[PDB]
Subunit: 149 residues, 3 copies
C-alpha cells in the first residue's frame, strides 16, 4: 500500500500535542507503520530541507527542526500522500482550513506542527532518508476491510 513520511515537529512535541496529532492521523484511516521519537541531527535536517537552501527562512527552519525531538512516521493507506496533505492543511496555518491539523493547532507559518511529504517522489526519498526498512512494519488491521473496496 502507498506510503508517505509524516513528522510531528518540535513545536507540537513541546506543546504536548503528540497524542492529539496522532489521533487525527489515525481517525482518518491512515495506518502507522513506522514511528520513532528522535532528535534530528544537523546533517539530516539539512538534507531533508535541501530544496529550501536559497530562502530567507532556511536558517530559522534548520535551527527549529533540530531544537528538540520530532516524532517521525511512515504512514500507509490508499492515496496516503495526498490524503495526509489534505488533513494537514496549507503551509501557512492562517490559510489552512479550520479542521485541519495546521488550521486548528498551528499559529504561524514557521511553527506549523507537522510535516508531510509533498509528492510520491518526495515520500520515497524522505521515507528512505529517515527510516531503514527494518524500522518499518507491515501488518493487516481489522478496519482494513472497512476502509477499502
Amino acid at each position: 500500500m502507498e506510503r508517505t513520511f509524516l513528522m510531528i515537529k518540535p513545536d507540537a512535541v513541546q506543546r504536548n500535542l503528540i497524542g492529539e496529532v496522532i489521533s487525527r492521523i489515525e481517525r482518518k484511516g491512515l495506518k502507522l507503520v513506522g514511528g520513532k521519537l528522535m532528535q534530528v541531527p544537523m546533517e539530516l535536517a539539512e538534507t531533508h530541507y535541501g530544496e529550501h537552501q536559497g530562502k530567507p527562512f532556511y536558517n530559522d527552519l534548520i535551527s527549529f527542526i533540530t531544537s528538540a525531538p520530532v516524532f517521525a512516521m511512515v504512514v500507509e493507506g490508499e492515496d496516503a500522500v495526498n490524503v495526509s496533505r489534505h488533513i494537514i492543511g496549507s503551509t501557512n496555518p492562517s490559510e489552512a482550513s479550520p479542521g485541519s491539523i495546521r488550521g486548528d493547532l498551528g499559529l504561524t507559518v514557521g511553527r506549523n506542527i507537522i510535516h508531510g511529504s509533498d509528492s510520491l517522489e518526495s515520500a520515497e526519498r524522505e521515507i528512505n532518508l529517515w527510516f531503514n526498512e527494518n524500522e518499518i512494519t507491515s501488518y493487516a488491521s481489522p478496519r482494513d476491510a472497512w476502509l477499502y473496496e
Copy 2:
C-alpha cells in the same frame, strides 16, 4: 419543521464511530427525531440507491451498504437538509473539507462514513422509505429557544 434522512454507514459502525458521528450532528444543533440500528434489506438498499444503477461502483455500493448494520436517522432543524450536507462534506473524503465528518473520518469515496439526503424532495422520499411515522418522535428541546430567532 424541515427534516432530513441521515444514515451512519457500515464502515463507521464496524470502526466503532457511531457515538462520534452522532456527537458531530448533535453539537451542530440538529435534533435527532428518529433513529434505529438496523440491517439493510437488499430491496431497501436498491430502491434507496437506485439512481446509481449502472455506474461502475453500484454493485460494490449495494454489497457494502448491506454488509453490516447502519444507524438510520431522521434529523430536524432549520435548513436541515443543506446544514447536514454541509457538515458531512463532499462525497469524496479527500475533497471533503477538513472538519467535516467525511473529511476527518473517511479515507475513500466508497467508504465515506455517513449518508445524507441531497434535496428536500429526496429527504421526504428517503424518510418515508426508511421510517414509518410512528417511528419518528416529536419533542421540544430546551435549546431551541436559542438556535433560532
Copy 3:
C-alpha cells in the same frame, strides 16, 4: 503584541459550550489575557453593535446579546484579529468552513456562538469599551518560544 476582543455569545453560554469554545481558542496558540462572564447592559450592546443600527436584524441582535450572560475576552498573539476570524468562520454558520467554531457549533446567522473584532481598529475600540487596562493581564507562557520565531 497584537490583541483582539472575542466574546462567547449567550447562545453558547445557554448550550453549555463555553469550555469547548475556549478550548478551540487556546489550542490555536492564542493567549487569553483578559476574560470575564458578565451580563451585557443595553447601552454596552448598543455601542458595541452601533454600526448595524439601521439593519432589519438590529433589534433581534440587541435582544439576543442582552438575554443571558456572555463571556468577554481579550486574546493576544501574532495576527490575532485575522487568526481569530479564521477559526471562528463566516458570519453564517452554513457558509462557515466545517472545523470552524461557527461551522461546527452554530445553526443560524443570528445565533452564531462567538464574536471577534473585525480589524485592528475595531479590536482596540472593543477592548477599550469592554475592559479596563487593569483587568488585562500581561504574561509570558511556556509555549510562546514554540509558537513564534
